[PDB]
Design a binder for these strands. Structure first.
Length: 303
DNA sequence: TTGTCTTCAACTGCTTTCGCGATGCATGCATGCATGCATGC
């Protein structure tokens, strides 16, 4: 009853997405008309926008104005009537289950089986139980079992590493026996930071644009390994090998490295330093409500 | 107008004997991830 961490499937689901986005396109085409293939799905899904430290959202103010009824019954069924037929052609080539699937999604029903629910089979149902027991044991603070789970999981030739916070917290409350925590974190980062589609990202990703998980997690957690102090110039040397260098938040990680080094003219240059990266992190992002707090601290330093 | 030595000044050649010693721009294969197509049961 939880998301699976393996690449969803082969099967039907492609032909279903076919039917879906093909029909979508026929209706939206005739709709702009009246208002006046993996690739068809691709263009289709394509032309569309793809007191505390909140990445504040973009709120409503310069946005738009009001609309007034577009769509009576007699006029919707206009736009519906033709594309449904063109659909009657390749519907003739997809399978019965997907005839009825398209039929119902087109009546506006919504399925009550899931892609997981219907992908039957010895092996996957076993993985499903394995991963469940993982997520359960981790909820239970049963770090030992949990760990056993995780290990037998990743042993299996199907699981992609989308279960890393799995370890990153698991191996984290497991001081016991294994290289851990930062080990995993900076490992993830080093491996998946270069070149060396669906079924993806925010908490996994590749290069050229940003990479939540591994990056920021080791990138603060090492600074927490320096709250273990009271290391830094290392974290800021290899933090100081950008660029993605639009990673503004990592600009704030850098400025944090300088406020922690600051804790004689050396300490000056470290406070000068943090003063610089805070605004080069006015790049944009959006942190630290008043930087005048950071700066009141920097004046407690200036003493 | 015209003779010509007059003058300055545009071209132009060499230099002690031996060994150790190309740049840019278009074409296409390369890599990787995702749909399609062919073999088999």
């Amino acid at each position: 009853m939880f998301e699976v961490p393996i690449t969803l499937t082969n099967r039907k689901f492609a032909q279903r997405r076919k039917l879906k986005y093909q029909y979508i396109n026929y209706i939206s085409r005739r709709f702009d008309r009246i208002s006046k293939q993996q690739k068809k799905r691709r263009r289709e899904r394509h032309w569309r926008s793809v007191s505390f430290e909140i990445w504040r959202t973009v709120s409503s103010q310069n946005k738009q104005p009001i609309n007034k009824q577009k769509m009576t019954y007699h006029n919707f069924k206009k736009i519906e009537k033709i594309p449904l037929r063109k659909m009657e052609i390749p519907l003739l080539h997809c399978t019965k289950e997907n005839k009825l699937y398209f039929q119902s999604i087109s009546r506006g029903l919504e399925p009550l089986k899931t892609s997981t629910s219907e992908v039957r089979n010895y092996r996957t149902r076993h993985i499903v139980t394995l991963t469940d027991l993982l997520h359960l044991n981790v909820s239970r603070h049963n770090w030992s079992l949990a760990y056993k789970i995780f290990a037998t999981l990743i042993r299996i030739p199907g699981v992609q590493i989308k279960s890393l916070w799995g370890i990153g917290v698991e191996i984290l409350d497991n001081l016991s026996n294994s290289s851990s925590g930062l080990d995993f974190l900076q490992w993830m980062c080093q491996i998946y930071s270069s070149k060396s589609r669906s079924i993806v990202p925010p908490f996994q990703t590749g290069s050229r644009t940003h990479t939540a998980k591994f990056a920021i997690t080791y990138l603060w957690s090492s600074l927490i390994n320096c709250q273990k102090s009271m290391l830094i110039d290392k974290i800021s040397e290899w933090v100081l090998t950008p660029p993605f260098m639009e990673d503004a938040e990592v600009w704030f990680i850098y400025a944090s490295c300088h406020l922690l080094k600051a804790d004689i003219n050396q300490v000056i240059k470290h406070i000068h330093y943090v003063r610089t990266f805070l605004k080069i992190c006015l790049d944009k992002g959006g942190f630290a409500v008043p930087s005048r707090l950071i700066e009141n601290q920097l004046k407690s330093f200036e003493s």
